[PDB]
C-alpha cells in the first residue's frame, strides 16, 4: 500500500469507479510484491474479482498499444514507470 502515484493518463470509455479500481488494482499489485509474474497473477485474480471475468492485462514498458474492448470496458493508463493496459473482453 502506497497510493502515492500521480497519473499521466488520457484514454476513457468506461465507468468511473471502475477506472479508479483499475488504477488501484494495477498499482496495488506492484505495491504488494517485488515479484512481477506473481504481481500479474494477482492482477488477474484481483480485477476479474472486482469487475467480473474476464479481464486481460499486459504489463511492461515496451509493447504496442491497441486492443479490442467490450463496450465501455477498457482503460488505458500510465503509472510509475510502466505502461499498463486493462480491457474487458468476455
Amino acid at each position: 500500500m502506497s497510493t502515492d502515484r500521480k497519473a499521466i493518463i488520457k484514454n476513457a470509455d468506461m465507468p468511473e469507479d471502475m477506472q479508479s479500481d483499475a488504477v488501484e488494482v494495477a498499482l496495488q499489485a506492484l505495491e504488494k510484491f517485488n515479484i512481477e509474474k506473481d504481481i500479474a497473477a494477482y492482477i488477474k485474480k484481483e480485477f476479474d474479482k472486482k469487475y467480473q471475468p474476464t479481464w486481460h492485462c499486459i504489463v511492461g514498458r515496451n509493447f504496442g498499444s491497441y486492443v479490442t474492448h467490450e463496450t465501455h470496458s477498457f482503460l488505458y493508463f500510465y503509472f510509475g514507470q510502466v505502461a499498463i493496459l486493462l480491457f474487458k473482453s468476455g
Binding site: K6, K10, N11, A12, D13, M14, P15, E16, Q19, H72
Partner: protein, 111 residues
C-alpha cells in the same frame, strides 16, 4: 531559464485540477447552463489561482469544455509552434456517467 524549481512543468497543478474536478462532480449532472457557469468558474478560478501562484514569468491560458456523456472513442491531435524552452502545455480527458470533460492548457514564459 527557470529550472525544475522555477520552470512551469505540468506535475504541480494537474493533481490539484483532478482533485478539484472529482470533488465538484460529486453532486452534479450535465445541464448546459450550469455547465457553462462551471466553465466560467473553472477558467477564471484556475487563471487567478496560477496568477497567485507566481511561477516565475509564466502566463497560463485554459480551455474548458463539458459535454453530455455518450461514451465515444476519441484520440486528440496535437501540434503547434513554440519557444518551449521554458513554455509548456498539456491535456487531460475524463469520463463521468453524467458528463465528459476535455481540458487543454497551454503555458508560456516572458522571453
Amino acid at each position: 531559464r527557470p529550472d525544475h524549481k522555477r520552470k512551469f512543468r505540468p506535475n504541480d497543478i494537474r493533481p490539484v485540477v483532478r482533485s478539484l474536478l472529482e470533488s465538484r462532480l460529486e453532486n452534479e449532472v450535465y445541464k448546459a447552463d450550469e455547465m457553462q457557469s462551471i466553465s466560467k468558474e473553472i477558467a477564471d478560478g484556475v487563471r487567478d489561482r496560477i496568477r497567485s501562484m507566481e511561477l516565475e514569468r509564466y502566463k497560463i491560458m485554459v480551455h474548458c469544455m463539458i459535454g453530455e456523456q455518450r461514451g465515444q472513442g476519441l484520440r486528440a491531435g496535437c501540434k503547434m509552434f513554440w519557444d518551449s524552452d521554458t513554455d509548456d502545455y498539456f491535456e487531460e480527458v475524463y469520463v463521468t456517467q453524467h458528463l465528459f470533460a476535455v481540458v487543454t492548457v497551454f503555458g508560456l514564459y516572458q522571453y
